[PDB]
């Protein structure tokens, strides 16, 4: 596990943010298990949205630690008014619209 995380760190340094998370989800089969688990679809959608936001925030931030610092800061004070931070639709299927 330490070795795979060290390789993930190398991928993170080289190819950016999204490649590391993608390789992690592929190797750990996170998406498959979440889709299998009841309700995990919303979880996977939120994870993907968080990954996209982390990529957008790491593009501007050159330091690797700065992205973690920014993520912790945003977790401390979530901005509800932000349109980007709005939660996306759960599924494209038929949903009761409240």
């Amino acid at each position: 596990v330490v070795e795979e995380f060290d390789g993930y760190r190398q991928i993170w340094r080289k190819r950016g943010v999204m490649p590391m998370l993608r390789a992690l989800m592929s190797a750990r089969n996170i998406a498959e298990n979440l889709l299998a688990t009841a309700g995990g679809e919303r979880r996977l959608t939120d994870i993907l949205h968080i990954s996209e936001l982390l990529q957008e925030a790491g593009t501007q931030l050159e330091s690797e630690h700065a992205l973690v610092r920014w993520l912790s800061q945003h977790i401390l004070e979530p901005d509800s008014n932000a349109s980007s931070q709005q939660m996306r639709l759960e599924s494209d299927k038929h949903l009761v619209q409240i």
């Binding site: 950016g16 999204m18 993608r22 089969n29 998406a31 498959e32 298990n33 996306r88 639709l89 494209d92």
Partner: protein, 775 residues
Amino acid sequence: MLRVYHSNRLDVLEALMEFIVERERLDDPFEPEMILVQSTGMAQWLQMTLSQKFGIAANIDFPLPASFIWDMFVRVLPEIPKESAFNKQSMSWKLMTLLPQLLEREDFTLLRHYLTDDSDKRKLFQLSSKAADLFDQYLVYRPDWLAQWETGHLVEGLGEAQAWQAPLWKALVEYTHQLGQPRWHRANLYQRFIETLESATTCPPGLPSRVFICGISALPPVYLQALQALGKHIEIHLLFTNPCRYYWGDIKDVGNPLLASWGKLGRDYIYLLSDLESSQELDAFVDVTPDNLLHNIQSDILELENRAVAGVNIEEFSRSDNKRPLDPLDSSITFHVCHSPQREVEVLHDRLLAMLEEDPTLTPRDIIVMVADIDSYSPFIQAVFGSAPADRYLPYAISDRRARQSHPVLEAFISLLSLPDSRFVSEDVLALLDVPVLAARFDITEEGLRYLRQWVNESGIRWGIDDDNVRELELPATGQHTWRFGLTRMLLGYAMESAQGEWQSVLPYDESSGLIAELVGHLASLLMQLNIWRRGLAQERPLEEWLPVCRDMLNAFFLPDAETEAAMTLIEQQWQAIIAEGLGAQYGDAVPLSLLRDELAQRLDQERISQRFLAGPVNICTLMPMRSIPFKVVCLLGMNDGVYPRQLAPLGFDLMSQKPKRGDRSRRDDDRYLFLEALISAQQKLYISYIGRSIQDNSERFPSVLVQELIDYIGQSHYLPGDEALNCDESEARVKAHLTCLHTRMPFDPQNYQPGERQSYAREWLPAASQAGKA
């Protein structure tokens, strides 16, 4: 003689240039070849092609039309300065001085109401900049107006704002005569330059043998007149990419709707070219065989014929045989509807992989991807093209992205310039300490920052560097929760244990007690500096006094390194250039720091890096005018209604937009013509994508009007096999629905993995789509 070369494609013009260069050789070897281009990518492509053909391309100058015409001014007429006195940069600072002296005038009464409430000359500077831009545009496109304004008369039948614009320009000229600067500017110089060569018995010395104008499809009428006057002595070869074979400028609406709508930029240009008296033109076109949908549309555009059927007659509206058969397997033109830009790029990657697999001859360099705004799609493009596996890896290079060489140093310096206005929040100062250069300057290690975070937090530092800063904001002096308070507290805690008690109504901070407290001594060294400068930058200073400010601040606050030296040099160069323009304009009055800071902020990010346009990998870049290069695969992203075309409305008091003439340029028409250039340049495949439904709200978006007209023309000009019995409208809707592809919202949707042409290439989401995982 001025020879105009017409060709539907660029490669023909380029080969003609090749043959002309090879046939007639330059006598002197060191004489540089002249090729006019308005874009760097066009020049780079020309160089790469000429080197590939001849064996090497060198000593080929690529100046802009304006700079070239100014160079010709310098050589043909004597007593002309190297650089024009009237430029966009200097007129701003000159009008900044001239406007306060003219507020007493009645004609400027409205301007008075504008300049009444300004405190730090913000409105004055912005108005001067806008007026300088307007005057430059007038110089370029409207010399008669300036010629009339200099004498003091008014132009009949013009805009209302002329009343306040005509005298100012006059008051400018006289002003630049008092300082002693050269009177000559291009507007008055045009007629004399034309007359000197018109009556010249022989060719003047120093002129180049021949000139080339390649890739420029838009020129002002005055430049064309100057080139016509210059064509007598020296030959000029204009390579003009013409989308239509026949005469399509002011046809004696154009015949083709897709050309009439998007051809406003080229109609005026071809009408000007036709109006040249001493021009000899030969047509070198290439016919296109209508074997594909894209080739069919290109042939319709080239032949200036209309293929869509309106259906006015009942017999015409009933049968669908009037349209052209469309092959179902054909995929030359394909429209794609996605949900998010991430999904859009992820689908574009798979489509590019499919196109590469389908055709062995295709190469990544041939493919090009153009987006409305490259900065909005840069993270998604980069992540999608980086996450691809090694066997699936596609090389990419992104062009026209904002030039960001060292962002933290730039932002730290910009924030340091705002010192007098800053409240010195603890988080803000820690953000300045984030930069490793500013910390190395005060030998603050990265491990020490973990300690200084909790120290600042627990000690109680909230805002304010000292009590004087608190009193300066007209707030009651408290004496606590300031940087001085926290520093004194930490020092007392290093000196005296907190168990003893208060000494000066300040509880010592026990945490900083050992050798680590030396960090405090370094931190207290920073703030003191932050104090000194925050007092030095308050007072307004003349321009010559602002010269050593930037260098002193950099060498005081920053300790350079191998990487940061470049950014520091760029900052110094921009600062020195701004102050040099100011001093050349002889601005006497004092200038506040808030003006130079906000000017440097605008000047630093205006840079762009397009050096990797044709590096070899697939090209990612925005749509830039005057850059038309043929490519096999041409993809277009971000075509949502409102994003493209990009709308930049005029200032509102410009006189050109009131009574427009032929040759006037507008960003709207520029984008409308770039969309046509993208269509014509596509040789094999055209890909167009746009966001249909918002991923967040599941709402409905719309595509650009251009894509709408394109799909309308397609649906009205073609019919699928087996739909002959159907009427025009049903067959049109069927074709439009067959070509428009609606992709899924999520990558793990199993529809993506069903066998077909829409089948994806990413196997990572295959087990998820198959629903084979365990809970």
